[PDB]
Structure 1
Amino acid sequence: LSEQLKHCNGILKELLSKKHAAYAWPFYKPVDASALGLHDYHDIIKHPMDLSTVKRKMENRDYRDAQEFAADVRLMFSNCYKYNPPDHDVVAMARKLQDVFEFRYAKMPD
């Protein structure tokens, strides 16, 4: 991994770590819409994303640069902001995890 992608990998490891789990857990794995009874989820969300998919993409060297990684993490949060009412607990969790992400992403070496 390039130096910028090492930083992205560090962020990802942090987002998956036990100290953020109280608000990160909804983002760990792909939404199982049928299991949750959300039969409109895949009509509304065209491009699902979650942290385990980001991790697999990192491991497989799919991301060619930090921008492509950031776009996927942000897509995950946007899906949450699109599907759920803005006062939902899951949205509050997203906002908190996105705060973790954006502040550390901004420290990217360059």
Structure 2
Amino acid sequence: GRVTNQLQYLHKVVMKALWKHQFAWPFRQPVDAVKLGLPDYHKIIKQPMDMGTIKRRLENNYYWAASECMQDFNTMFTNCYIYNKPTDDIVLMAQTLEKIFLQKVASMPQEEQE
């Protein structure tokens, strides 16, 4: 429970841009193993993560520090590289989204205030 200048930057700057990105749609909500037909998804991915959950957590002061939030973004991206075949379009979409993420994090203000 906490609001800091970094967490605010992750919510209003970084996540805002990632969210409406043209390749964001598969990431805005939890992966639906049933709907998408991957009955083995949850046997391989033990810690599912998606942008909806991350956004909600930033809106409820769930995070104590920005690093905990960055870790969730990383898990979401990593889940995708681990589970899918190397050639899937989804892998390309996650790498594209992750580069934005890393680029924005590099400019995250360092004052870790509040």
Shift of 1:39: 0.4
Deviation per residue, 1:27-55 (Å, 9 max, x gap) = 11101101111100000000000000001
| Percent of pairs with identical residues | 48
Q: Spell out the pairing of 1:58-97 with structure 2 (5 A cutoff).
A: 58-97=58-97
Deviation per residue, 1:3-40 (Å, 9 max, x gap) = 111111121111112xx12x111111101101111100
Equivalent-residue separation in structure 2 for 1:13 and 1:53 (angstroms): 14
Larger RCO (CA under 8 A, 6+ residues apart) = 2
Partner amino acid, structure 2, of 1:6: Q
Equivalent-residue separation in structure 2 for 1:66 and 1:53 (angstroms): 15
Equivalent-residue separation in structure 1 for 2:29 and 2:88 (angstroms): 19
* Runs (5+) with no aligned partner, structure 1: none
* Aligned residue in 2 for 1:106: 106
* Aligned residue in 2 for 1:7: 9
Equivalent-residue separation in structure 2 for 1:99 and 1:93 (angstroms): 10
Which TM-score applies when normalising by structure 1? Answer: 0.93
Which TM-score applies when normalising by structure 2? Answer: 0.90
> SS state of the match for residue 34, structure 2?
coil
RMSD of aligned residue pairs (Cα, Å):
0.8
* Runs (5+) with no aligned partner, structure 2: none
Shift of 1:60: 1.1
Deviation beyond 6 Å, 4+ runs, structure 1: none
Partner amino acid, structure 2, of 1:74: N
